[PDB]
Structure 1
Amino acid sequence: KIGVVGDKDSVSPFRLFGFDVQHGTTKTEIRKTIDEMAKNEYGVIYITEQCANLVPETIERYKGQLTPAIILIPSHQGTLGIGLEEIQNSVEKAV
């Protein structure tokens, strides 16, 4: 069970595979996607970083939960650098 969220051009290639691909653009309905993507047991969700600055709350909420495995990805243009952020504060928070 895999879902992906982002821009159609960059993400519709995932539809070749069995990925319930969305094209969400909203700040709250992106959560609404992810929330219906939460009560169905989709193991992993791929997210273009361009969509993640919209609804940052919802991936901090399920961050402590195993499912869904919320994953930030660059779109066809580029990432916003969510990798530089979250690996940096997470390593220092623990230690």
Structure 2
Amino acid sequence: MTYKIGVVGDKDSVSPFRLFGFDVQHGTTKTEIRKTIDEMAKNEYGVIYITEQCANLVPETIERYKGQLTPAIILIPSHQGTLGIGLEEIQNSVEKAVGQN
């Protein structure tokens, strides 16, 4: 089954993904980013890579899709690094699985 790849992040960091046929967008606000993610998920994107700085603004949107097969919303650093969110989220899935909250 064949799916597109999206990327949401700052131009400096995510522009090279355009060379690979990834759909690269660059929102700065909660609203912009949320709308981008919903549009990708409406267009059957398999994966969305999203820089942590962008992801930091839309936790509610990201949590909505977490239980869905696609899209897989994957946080990545920017050239300035991470906010630690991807890592914390791995710990959150553990706490969910083992029933610790």
State the TM-score bracket (shorter-chain normalisation): over 0.9
> Percent identity over the alignment?
100
Per-residue CA deviations over 1:31-86 (Å, capped at 9, x if unaligned) read: 10001111101101100001011111101001111111100000000100013311
Give the total of aligned pairs.
Answer: 95
- What is the CA–CA distance in structure 1 between the aligned matches of 2:54 and 2:88, rounded to whole Å? 16
Unaligned runs of 5+ in 1: none
The TM-score with structure 2 as length reference comes to 0.90
The TM-score with structure 1 as length reference comes to 0.95
Unaligned runs of 5+ in 2: none
- What is the CA–CA distance in structure 2 between the aligned matches of 1:15 and 1:89, rounded to whole Å? 32
- What is the CA–CA distance in structure 2 between the aligned matches of 1:83 and 1:61, rounded to whole Å? 16
Of Structure 1 and Structure 2, the greater helix share is in 2
Runs of 4+ more than 3 Å apart: none
Per-residue CA deviations over 1:16-41 (Å, capped at 9, x if unaligned) read: 11011001111112010001111101
